[PDB]
Structures are given as C-alpha cells and as structure tokens.
Nucleic acid binder design. Sequence first.
RNA 1: ACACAC
Length: 118
Amino acid sequence: QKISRPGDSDDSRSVNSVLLFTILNPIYSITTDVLYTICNPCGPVQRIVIFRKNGVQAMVEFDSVQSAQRAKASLNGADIYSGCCTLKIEYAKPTRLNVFKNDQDTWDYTNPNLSGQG
RNA sequence: ACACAC
C-alpha cells in the first residue's frame, strides 16, 4: 500500500485540476449536464467533454486542485443513475481543452461565446 | 475507457 507522502502520493505529484471519467455501464446517454450535476457540489466546474473513441468516457476541469481532489475522492465508484452508469476517476495528463461549441456532449462553464457555436 | 469531443 502507498504511504502518504508529498512528491510521491497521487495527490501531490499528479494534480493538474483535470480528471478523467470512466463509465462502467453506459446503458444510458451520458451528458455534460448530469456530469455537472455531480461535479458542481464538489467545486466550481470550468469545462466538461465526452468521447466514445475506445468505449465511453468523459472529462472534467476544475477552478482549483482542491476541488479536483474531493471530486476524484467522492465521485469515484459513485453512480449517475443510482444503480447503473458507475464511475471511475483519476488525474488526467493534458491540461487544457480547445472547446468549440456547447451541446449535450461538450460544454464550457465560463466562456459564454461557445453557446452560439452549436 | 486520457480531452481535442464537429
């Protein structure tokens, strides 16, 4: 088991305020709204995106590392449906999106100019 | 199941 230490534990050498969201049971259409509904109480979300390239996944970005730490520690193993759409969460390696519009699979919670690009 | 989701 990993001992808690700075510069070694996941929470002290891999934190970039960005997280990856893996869906275990995509029996329903996942959207940026439901991901925001569970991520917003964990902190002020800034961006959300969804992709299907290798399965079913989503991404989230926070205004602070502290919001990403409690989101990754509370929403992990949680479910969107309260019976299905189970989650897994970990720190992401990229650090910024290049969002171009807002819709059910892509969104930006601070740039209003992408709302008309739908 | 790691953003570039058209």
